[PDB]
């Protein structure tokens, strides 16, 4: 048929997608800025489509309900035909790859530990061997599923603690996890992706830091409904931008060029 | 060969694929050992196929002849139907993605610099600003094509030197590049992938090292002919091995430090 505007689902997560100054008087794509906003423009240019950025209604990345088997979040938007493509920090996983298509990765990450500066923790092993410092993850995302599914001893032990901790150690947004670290005087550590960890490390008031190596190795991919014709072009577009060095420049732009914690 | 046997093309490259001690009295797949040999056994187990490891005839990774547009190396064996799958340190690239299918990556790497210890080079920009130290890459692989195609200023400069330098700064195998670094009294630096660089750095005679950050970011993927029915299962197998932590275990095994260098 005729060309249609591509519906892009994404999520309000700094610095991938953020509300612009003066958004209250702006409309459409102009309301937003950030890494994924820039990336969407580049992909659309190379692929020759027009698009509309739409923030996912429930504010979630995507998990499948154990009983109803219904997908929520951005994954759900794709699975149920509400969006044509997701351009977001959406982690490539086995269970997701089974139900949606992913491009080759446009950014790499690993699960990591965020602490308030001075917290006596240097590794996940350290966390699992004490009880004074609480720790948790984001809901409805790939980090929580990693711990839940892990057969690796240290991570299984961490999940056994987190799943039953009271009050809840899980948070609904990355921002909530960051606040909890910042406000708990070193008694909360947050498990999150190294990308978001490194970003927060560069923001005022510069009171957090990433410690230890990453617990795993994966990446974000641009996602489409299974078998979507958009897939092939978008995938080549990611590899081209990668080869051209544009993805490296975009990360530098949003993470470090305007970092708030010094040069 | 035998019916229902998957033909695997691979390449002799330590520690991915190596001839076992006393291989001359062994036969078939048992002649070989290494990271990729272990990976092939794991992939074949998950996907349920029997397979035959074959070393690529011309000992090359894969490039397209500018004149004849003919692909050589492992890429060629996939394109012209000599093999069903490549399980090897074969780099995901834009130009290759256009002609073959790649799994999601099973290992990450970047282009990196290998120098003789003591060499006064700390970066790619350093190499480009001087002319006493020669430098080159492997023929018929992705590192050479990267420099040839690059519009990034420093890399374009390096390519302008390398393509015309004489005697040829290019080498036929990784071992030959490493040997040249070791014998040139510091007057040759080798551009190779960080994985191989890191492997060599830990082996006797302990006289090489990796310097600077990586020049780019990419990975190896398991490759199949375009539209192969094997693609989907192999891809899911890679993500499953990744999430089980088996790719990390395999890396730790074949990059295991026995302390040939230092403590
Ligand atoms: O999630 S993935 O596509 N497969 C697993 N791996 C690691 C290398 C094995 C990575 C690594 C980096 C990346 O950007 C994406 C992936
Ligand atoms: O070659 S790729 O599939 N696309 C480009 N990128 C980098 C993150 C943008 C990576 C990174 C790591 C990896 O293992 C594979 C790839
Ligand atoms: N990027 C993750 C969300 C963040 C996290 O789980 O730590 C996902 O796609 O689910
Ligand atoms: N992994 C490379 C070969 C080594 C190199 O080019 O440095 C390829 O697939 O072409
Ligand atoms: Cl429309
Ligand atoms: Cl021998
Ligand atoms: Cl010329």
A131 vs A122: CA distance, rounded Å: 15
User: Which residue spans within B61-145 are E strands per DSSP?
Assistant: 85-86, 100-102, 107-109, 111-116, 134-137
Residue B235 CA neighbour count, 13 Å, CB half = 21
B193 is in an annotated binding site: yes
What's domain A1-109+219-258's superfamily in CATH? Answer: Periplasmic binding protein-like II (3.40.190.10)
Across chain B, how many H-helices and E-strands are there?
Answer: 10, 13
Backbone angles phi, psi at A216, to 5 degrees: -155, -175
Which is it for strands B218-220 and B107-109: parallel, antiparallel or unpaired? Answer: antiparallel
Answer whether A102's CB lies under 8 Å from A192's CB. no
Count other Cβ atoms within 10 Å, centred on residue B87: 32
CA distances from B39 to B2, B84, B174 (A): 22, 16, 21
The SS3 of residue A221 is coil
Provide the 8-state DSSP code for A115.
Answer: E
Contact of B110 with B193, CB cutoff 8 Å? yes
Is B143 in contact with B150 (CB distance < 8 Å)?
A: no
Nearest chain B residue to A104 by CA: give it. Answer: B104
Residue B98 · residue B222 · CB < 8 Å: no
Contact call for residues B134 and B225 (beta carbons, < 8 A)? no
Burial class (CB in 10 A: 0-12, 13-18, 19+), B166: exposed
Q: Kindly list the distances between the CA atom of residue A255 and the CA atoms of A14, A15, A231, A236, B4, in Å, as whole numbers in the listed order.
A: 10, 8, 28, 25, 50
| A19 touches B at CB < 8 Å | no
Distances, alpha carbon A36 to alpha carbons A32, A103, B214, in Å:
10, 14, 24
Query: DSSP readout, A62-111?
Result: --B-TTT--B-HHHHHHHTTS-SEE-SS-B--HHHHTTEEEPSPSEEE-E
CA gap A62, A97 in Å, rounded:
12
The dotted CATH code for A110-218 is 3.40.190.10
Q: Count H helices, E strands: chain A? A: 10, 13
Q: How many CA atoms lie within 13 A of A212 on its CB side?
A: 23
Packing angle, helices B35-47 and B231-243, rounded to 10: 110
Q: CB A98 to CB B244 under 8 A?
A: no
Q: Resolution for this model in angstroms, one decimal place?
A: 1.9
What lies within 8 Å, CB to CB, of A213 at 6+ separation is: A110, A123
Can you tell me the distance from the alpha carbon of A30 to that of A19, in angstroms, rounded to the nearest whole number?
A: 9
Q: Are strands A218-220 and A107-109 parallel, antiparallel or unpaired?
A: antiparallel
Residue of A97, A243, A245 with shortest CB distance to B236: A97
Query: Which residues touch A250 (CB under 8 Å, ≥6 apart)?
Result: A35, A38, A39
d(CA A15, CA A196): 8
Residues of A in contact with B244 (CB under 8 A): 151
Distance between start and end Cα atoms, chain A: 52
B220 lines ligand 1 (CB under 6 A): no
Residue B259's CB is within 10 A of a number of other CB atoms, namely 7
CA distance A198 to B146: 28
Ligand nearest to the CA of A84: 5
Q: What is the DSSP string of A136-185?
A: E-BTTSHHHHHHHH--SHHHHHHHHHHHH-SS---BSSHHHHHHHHHHTT
Cite the beta strand spans of A122-200 per DSSP E.
Answer: 134-136, 188-193
Alpha carbons B152 and A245: distance in angstroms, whole number: 8
Q: Within 13 Å of residue B13, how many CA atoms lie on the same side as its CB?
A: 25
User: Using CA positions, which residue lies closest to atom 8 of ligand 2?
Assistant: A107
Per-domain boundaries in chain B: 1-109+219-258, 110-218
Q: How was this structure determined?
A: X-ray
**Cα–Cα distance between A141 and A176 in angstroms, integer?**
15
DSSP characters for A3-56? ---EEEEE---TTTSEEPTTGGG--GGGGEESHHHHHHHHHHHHHT--EEEEE-
* A174 has binding-site annotation: no
Q: Would you give the end-to-end CA distance of chain B in angstroms?
A: 48
Backbone angles phi, psi at A43, to 5 degrees: -65, -45
- Round to whole Å and give the CA distance between A17 and A3: 26
Q: Which two tokens stand for residue B107?
A: 């290992």
Q: What angle do the packed helices B142-149 and B153-164 form, to 10 degrees?
A: 110
Q: What is the DSSP letter of B197?
A: H
**CA-CA distance, B57 to B59, in Å (whole number)?**
6
Q: How far is CA A253 from CA A90, A246, B102, in A?
A: 20, 10, 30
Among candidates B110, B115, B118, which has minimal Cα distance to B155? Answer: B110
Ligand 2, from B95, B105, B221: best to mutate by most atoms within 8 Å of Cβ?
Answer: B105
Asked if domains B1-109+219-258 and B110-218 share a fold, the reply is yes
DSSP class of B152: S
Share in percent of chain A as helix, strand, coil (round to 5) = 40, 20, 45
Distance B166 CA to ligand 7 centre (A): 13
B91 is in an annotated binding site: yes
How far, in Å, from the CA of A195 to the mean position of ligand 7?
43
Strand-pair category, B111-116 with B208-211 = antiparallel
- Which of B227, B223, B197, B254 lies closest to B43, judged by CA? B223
Residue A168's SS3 state is: coil
Cα separation, B228 vs A73, whole angstroms: 32
How many Å apart are CA B180 and CA B28, to the nearest integer? 33
Q: Packing angle between helix B246-254 and helix B231-243, nearest 10 degrees?
A: 80
Q: How many other C-beta atoms can be found within 10 angstroms of the C-beta atom of residue A92?
A: 20
Q: Which chain A residues are within 8 Å of B152, Cβ to Cβ? A: 244-245
CA B11/CA B213 separation, integer angstroms = 27
Residues 6+ apart with CB under 8 A from A1: none
């Amino acid at each position: 048929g005729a060309n249609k505007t591509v519906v892009v689902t994404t999520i309000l997560e700094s610095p991938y997608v953020m509300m612009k100054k003066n958004h209250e008087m702006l409309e459409g794509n102009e309301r937003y800025e950030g890494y994924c906003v820039d990336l969407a423009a580049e992909i659309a240019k190379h692929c020759g489509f027009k698009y509309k950025l739409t923030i996912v209604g429930d504010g979630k990345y995507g998990a499948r309900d154990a009983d109803t088997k219904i997908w929520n979040g951005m994954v759900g938007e794709l699975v149920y035909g509400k969006a044509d493509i997701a351009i977001a920090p959406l982690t490539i996983t086995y269970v997701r790859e089974e139900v949606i298509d992913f491009s080759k990765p446009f950014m790499s990450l690993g699960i990591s530990i965020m602490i308030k500066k001075g917290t006596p923790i240097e590794s996940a092993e350290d966390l699992s061997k004490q009880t004074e410092i609480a720790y948790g993850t984001l809901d409805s995302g790939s980090t929580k599923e990693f711990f839940r599914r892990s057969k690796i001893a240290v991570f299984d032990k961490m999940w056994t603690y987190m799943r039953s901790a009271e009050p809840s150690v899980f948070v609904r947004t990355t921002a909530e996890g960051v606040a909890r670290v910042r406000k708990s005087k070193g008694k909360y550590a947050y498990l999150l992706e190294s990308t978001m960890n490194e970003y927060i490390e560069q923001r005022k008031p510069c009171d957090t830091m990433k410690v230890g190596g990453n617990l795993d190795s994966k990446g974000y991919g641009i996602a489409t409904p299974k078998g979507s014709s958009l897939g092939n072009a978008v995938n080549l577009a990611v590899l081209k931008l990668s080869e051209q060095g544009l993805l490296d420049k975009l990360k530098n732009k949003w993470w470090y060029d305007k970092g708030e914690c010094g040069s």
